[PDB]
């Protein structure tokens, strides 16, 4: 079947794996700094909540698994290496489809991917420096008068990367909408008509991006529906 | 196919969803009181165990997730709204099957559902006010001499809801057995002969209501087997 078009795929995957490996090595070397950067918002929120509680009248970052610290360090290093391998993962992926983009879409793809990457980066930066500091406090001040916030690093790391990745994508969808709309391929009528259909697929996507709880599915579908409405407004 | 019998289904689902939404709104308004009611037995058990330990010679309710308090409040509100929308849920469900119960079962269904609901509420009340206060202590005093009880609200809410719901059902099965037996449809012979087959389905049902561990599957199948024996005795 597709036997001749496999050697290039093998080489691309080999270079991708090597890139992920070197990124992992560098990230594990810098794991102290990376973990400090990840945990700074949580520490600041805990200190602020403690000050508020003391003014009204403890908190710390814990680990609930014996290998929890090592597992968290390894996971953060792996994620950073994958992120540090993004330029080379694109180097492998784009070079794979060489004849697909003959002369025109070959020129159109580069600004699109550049804009998507820069907007994902700006979304992650906005999530870390704006949304999280004013949100984590609100998440901790809610239970500050009923419970004690013993936050484990194992769950916190996953929660933090989930928020960062989602907010990065949340700033990418209304840029791919802009690219597609200004390209002229899709008009406002197409998205306005296919509104009910979106209703289900978004609700399906939330079913796959959340734990099995129905409440999580609703809490993920609502922002996605808001983003769909935002794209509806954006297309002109 | 079943196209004409779909508009009524759509209307029933829509009004049920609206009822669930209004219940969620009310429950999130009263979430402080609801969470206090849920967490009162745990606090009492912690205080009693602490007094016992001090007399022999700490404990608190914690949250292990940054959004754990908000998620717990939302989950409790959603559960309360679903419970608060149960009367209108049955309003929609019963009205759906209008012609199925022509003249006799139409009048026989109402006492059955009324009795089932009242026994479910009495079972929840019995579990909250009798079983839990004398059980939670035993679940905490068992490990009070080896470990420290830092109970997270995220798992406690699920555990308490599961116990309450199961005990409500545990007081409903030997009422549906009573209804079926007094109706005359099922005698003692039917349940006595079909004993071995039950051994399967219960173990299957207990397999679907538990985490993947085998031990908890057995620990759920045993009370169901006891309930089956109780129903066997009840048939008269």
């Amino acid at each position: 079947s597709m036997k001749p078009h496999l050697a290039e795929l093998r080489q691309r995957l080999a270079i991708s794996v090597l890139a992920v490996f070197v990124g992992f090595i560098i990230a594990f070397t810098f794991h102290n700094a990376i973990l400090g950067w990840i945990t700074k918002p949580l520490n600041n929120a805990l200190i602020q909540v403690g000050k508020i509680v003391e003014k009204r009248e403890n908190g710390m970052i814990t680990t609930h698994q014996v290998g929890g610290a090592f597992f968290v360090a390894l996971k953060v290093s792996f994620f950073a290496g994958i992120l540090m391998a993004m330029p080379v993962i694109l180097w492998q992926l784009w070079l794979f489809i060489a004849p697909g983009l003959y002369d025109n879409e070959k020129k159109m793809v580069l600004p699109f991917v550049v804009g998507g990457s820069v907007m994902f980066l700006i979304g992650v930066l906005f999530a870390y420096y704006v949304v999280t500091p004013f949100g984590f406090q609100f998440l901790i001040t809610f239970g500050s008068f009923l419970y004690t916030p013993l936050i484990n690093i194992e769950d916190y790391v996953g929660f933090f990367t989930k928020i960062l990745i989602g907010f990065g994508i949340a700033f990418e969808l209304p840029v791919v909408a802009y690219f597609l709309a200004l390209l002229g391929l899709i008009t406002d009528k197409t998205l306005k008509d296919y509104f009910k259909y979106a209703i289900v697929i978004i609700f399906l996507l939330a079913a796959f991006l959340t734990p099995p709880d129905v409440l999580t599915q609703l809490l993920m579908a609502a922002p996605l529906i808001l983003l769909y409405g935002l794209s509806i407004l954006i297309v002109h | 196919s079943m196209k004409p019998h779909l508009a009524e289904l759509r209307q029933r689902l829509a009004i049920s969803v609206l009822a669930v939404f209004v219940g969620f709104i009310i429950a999130f308004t009263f979430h402080n009181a609801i969470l206090g009611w849920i967490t009162k037995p745990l606090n009492n058990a912690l205080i009693q165990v602490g007094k016992i330990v001090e007399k022999r010679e700490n404990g608190m309710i914690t949250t292990h997730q940054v959004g754990g308090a908000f998620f717990v409040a939302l989950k409790v509100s959603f559960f309360a709204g679903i419970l608060m929308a149960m009367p209108v849920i049955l309003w929609q469900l019963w009205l759906f099957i209008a012609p199925g119960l022509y003249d006799n079962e139409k009048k026989m269904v109402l006492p059955f559902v009324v009795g089932g609901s009242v026994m479910f509420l009495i079972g929840v009340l019995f579990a909250y006010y009798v079983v839990t206060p004398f059980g939670f202590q035993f679940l905490i005093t068992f490990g009070s001499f080896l470990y420290t009880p830092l109970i997270n609200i995220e798992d406690y809410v699920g555990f308490f809801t599961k116990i309450l719901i199961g005990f409500g059902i545990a007081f409903e099965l030997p009422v549906v057995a009573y209804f079926l037996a007094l109706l005359g449809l099922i005698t003692d012979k039917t349940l006595k002969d079909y004993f071995k087959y039950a051994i399967v389905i219960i173990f299957l049902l207990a397999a679907f209501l538990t985490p993947p561990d085998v031990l908890t599957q057995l620990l759920m199948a045993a009370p169901l087997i006891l309930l089956y024996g109780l129903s066997i005795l009840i048939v008269h």
Binding site: K196, L204, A207, P212, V214, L218 | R10
Partner: peptide, 16 residues
């Protein structure tokens, strides 16, 4: 998924 596809079915019935 898991028990959430029920809600997907529900949204199809609610939105045709």
């Amino acid at each position: 998924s898991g028990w959430e596809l029920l809600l997907v079915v529900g949204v199809i019935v609610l939105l045709f």
